[PDB]
């Protein structure tokens, strides 16, 4: 991260006199104080708590400077109207400074996303960096940019949306050289009206691109009204310019042929969508001087990530939302908010299962308690709590919810009511229910999610 204090202040329109402080070359930028090391930039954001509360901890951990919306006594600080806007301005600047080629991709559906496939193909030739996990939003994307290893030649940025316009912002921020749009399987759509509005939002990905730049978009007509006018658009799907003409899905792998490729590709995954993802990633990689042979060998060893978190089904028909990514309090708040904003299926309830977050140190109990502000008796019919640090939150919810709408199960260094928790979830979960599970990744949460799926 080639950045100094005065340079950031310049870039973000610092409102304080920065010359008071040394112009130190910075190390990395973090919004999670646990990740701060010597020489870092702290970025205090509105999370489950406002990151301003953790500025002192950041400096104890070695931060050299912090962005801030208020004066910070006894520490170097960069005073701005809004930290996140500053963060985003900084990432956009960093892209201008490094002039890295940016590849923007939407839509993350399973265990081998277009973002991961594309980065993997570009890596054959180029120092390539990419969005890690699900860091694809107004916070994750700027973080990704600022974490790009010095010398990177190609940067693959996934861009997600929760509300229409989210992708416009990210595209205008990143100014992609090239973009890919894929459509997924909504199930239920949270803050989006219908499939058209979904497609509208995804096609904003081309908003920040220069005329004549390449955009891959599906053949599906839902995107038609939203096609850019001044980009080079290439469609993919049955009948379109890019097309899969043959496909064998085996045991645990798949072989397929794309019209524009000389030979079949082999992938060590299953599913239609993956062949499509492979195909469109391949096309772009070809445009970047990667050979078909390089692409074929590359796919012989492709990474599977965690299943990019979404909905599953229990074997009784219920809708499971298991959120494995990001075991931190803000991610807990946020998934609570998202899950809560989904309407319940006709005939069904909404159940949340919450377990202890880990590595919150001395602050663990209070940060769990903080989730009370994200729990609403109106939308959540049953909240079930599992762990030890989460006990006080369970108590708070039991006071704030109707009689009988909360359950707590103990998990300590000795006692463990996992067995009871499982029974209770099974008894409470109807065929038309929605159930959210969120905690750290434990063997038990994993055993639970599995007793439902089975
Ligand atoms: N709120 C909050 C906290 C965090 N929030 C995040 O990591 C975070 C996580 C997310 S996110 O949802 O995970 N996100 C990632 C980016 O892509 C989008 C999805 C987002 Cl959008 C935003 C934030 Cl700000 S991480 C974290 C917190 C609270 C405190 N933490 C550890 C800690 C422990 C002890 C002390 C302490 N205080 N006094 N003595 N010790 C201070 C901090 C770690």
Q: Is 284 helix (H, G, I), strand (E, B) or coil?
A: helix
Beta strands in 212-301 (DSSP E): 214-218, 232-236, 244-249, 254-258, 265-267
Distance CA 325, CA 134 (A): 7
C-alpha angle with apex 293: 288 to 296, nearest 5 degrees? Answer: 95
187: enclosing H helix or E strand:
none
Atom of ligand 1 nearest to the CA of 141: 17
Residue 399: Cβ-neighbour burial (10 angstroms; 0-12, 13-18, 19+): exposed
Could you tell me if 352 and 397 are in contact, meaning their C-beta atoms sit under 8 angstroms apart? no
Nearest by Cα to 314 from 363, 348, 340 = 348
- List beta partners, residue 178: 103, 214
Q: Using a CB cutoff of 8 Å and minimum separation of 24, what contacts does 49-52 make?
A: 49/329, 49/367, 49/370, 51/83
Distance CA 370, CA 176 (A): 38
Could you tell me if 32 and 135 are in contact, meaning their C-beta atoms sit under 8 angstroms apart? no
Sheet of 29-30, strand order: 29-30, 41-42, 65-68, 77-79
311: its two tokens: 């909905």
H-type alpha helices, 47-165: 55-60, 83-98, 114-122, 140-146
- Beta-carbon contacts of residue 247 (< 8 Å; ≥ 6 apart): 254, 255, 256, 257, 272, 275
Atom of ligand 1 nearest to the CA of 360: 33
| Residue 312 Cα distances to 187, 333, 422, 454, angstroms | 10, 21, 18, 12
Distance CA 309, CA 111 (A): 10
Could you tell me if 411 and 418 are in contact, meaning their C-beta atoms sit under 8 angstroms apart? yes
Nearest by Cα to 94 from 129, 62, 118, 134 = 129
Give the alpha-carbon dihedral of 236, 240, 245, 247, to 10 degrees. 30
Phi, psi of 406 (to 5 degrees): -130, 150
Instruction: Please enumerate, by residue number, every residue annotated as part of a binding site.
Output: 107-113
Q: Helix 83-98 to helix 166-174 angle, to the nearest 10 degrees?
A: 40
CA-proximal residue: ligand 1, atom 21 (nearest)? 139
> How far apart are the CA of 211 and the centre of ligand 1, in A?
39
**DSSP secondary structure string for all residues of 9-43:** HHHHT-SS-GGGS--PBP--EESSGGG--TTPEE-
> How far apart are the CA of 272 and the centre of ligand 1, in A?
37
Residue 358: Cβ-neighbour burial (10 angstroms; 0-12, 13-18, 19+): middle
Nearest by Cα to 24 from 11, 12, 41, 36 = 41
Could you tell me if 368 and 357 are in contact, meaning their C-beta atoms sit under 8 angstroms apart? yes
447: enclosing H helix or E strand:
helix 443-453
Ligand 1 contacts (CB < 6 A) are 31-34, 45, 47-49, 51, 54, 57, 135, 137, 139-140, 143, 326, 328-331, 334, 360-363, 367
Distance CA 207, CA 201 (A): 10
Method underlying the structure: X-ray
CA-proximal residue: ligand 1, atom 33 (nearest)? 360
Question: What domains can be seen in the chain, in order of their start residue?
Answer: 1-80 (3.40.1390.10), 81-303 (3.40.1190.10), 304-454 (3.90.190.20)
Instruction: Please enumerate, by residue number, every residue annotated as part of a binding site for ATP.
Output: 107-113
Phi, psi of 180 (to 5 degrees): -130, 130
**DSSP secondary structure string for all residues of 139-164:** THHHHHHHTPPTT--EEEEE---SST
- List beta partners, residue 435: 320, 351
Sheet of 244-249, strand order: 244-249, 254-258, 265-267
Distance CA 139, CA 144 (A): 9
């Amino acid at each position: 991260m080639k950045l100094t204090i005065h340079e950031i202040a310049q870039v973000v329109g610092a409102k304080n006199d920065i010359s008071i402080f040394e112009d130190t070359q910075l190390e990395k930028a973090e919004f999670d104080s646990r990740l701060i090391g010597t020489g870092d930039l702290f970025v205090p954001l509105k999370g489950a708590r406002d990151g301003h509360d953790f500025i002192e901890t950041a400096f104890e951990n070695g931060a050299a400077v912090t962005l801030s919306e208020k004066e910070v006594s006894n520490h170097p600080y960069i005073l701005v109207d809004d930290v996140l806007t500053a963060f985003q301005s900084l990432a956009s600047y960093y892209l201008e400074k490094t002039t890295v080629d940016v590849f923007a991709v939407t839509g993350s559906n399973g265990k081998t996303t277009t973002k991961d496939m594309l980065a993997h193909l570009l890596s054959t030739r180029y120092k390539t960096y990419k969005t890690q996990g699900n860091y694809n939003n107004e916070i994750g994307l700027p973080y990704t940019v600022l974490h790009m290893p010095e010398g990177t030649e190609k940067l693959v940025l996934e861009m997600g949306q929760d509300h229409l316009g989210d992708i416009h912002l990210l595209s205008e921020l990143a100014r992609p050289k090239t973009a890919i749009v894929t459509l997924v399987g909504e199930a239920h759509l949270a803050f989006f009206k219908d499939r058209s509005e979904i497609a509208k939002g995804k096609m904003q990905i081309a908003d920040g691109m220069a005329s004549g730049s390449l955009l891959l978009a599906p053949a599906d007509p839902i995107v038609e009204d939203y096609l850019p006018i001044d980009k080079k658009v290439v469609r993919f799907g049955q009948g379109a310019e890019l097309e899969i003409t043959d496909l064998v899905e085996r045991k645990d792998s798949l072989t397929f042929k794309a019209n524009f490729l000389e030979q079949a590709l082999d992938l060590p995954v299953t599913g239609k969508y993956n062949a499509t993802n492979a195909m469109i990633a391949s096309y772009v990689a070809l445009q970047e001087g990667v050979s078909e042979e390089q692409i074929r060998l590359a796919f012989q060893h492709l990474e599977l990530t965690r299943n990019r978190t979404e909905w599953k089904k229990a074997a009784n028909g219920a809708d499971i939302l298991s959120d494995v990514y990001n075991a931190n309090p803000t991610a807990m708040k946020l998934i609570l908010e998202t899950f809560s904003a989904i309407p319940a299926n006709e005939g069904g309830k909404k159940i949340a299962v919450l377990a202890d977050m880990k590595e919150l140190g001395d602050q663990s109990v209070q940060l769990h308690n903080q989730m009370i502000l994200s729990l609403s008796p109106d939308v959540l019919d049953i909240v079930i709590f599992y762990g030890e640090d989460i006990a006080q939150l369970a108590q708070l919810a039991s006071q704030m919810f109707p009689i009988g709408h909360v359950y707590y199960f103990k998990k300590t260094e000795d006692q463990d009511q996992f067995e009871d928790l499982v029974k209770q979830v099974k008894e409470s979960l109807g065929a038309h229910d929605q159930i959210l599970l969120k905690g750290s990744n434990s063997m038990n949460l994993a055993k639970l999610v599995e007793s439902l799926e089975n």
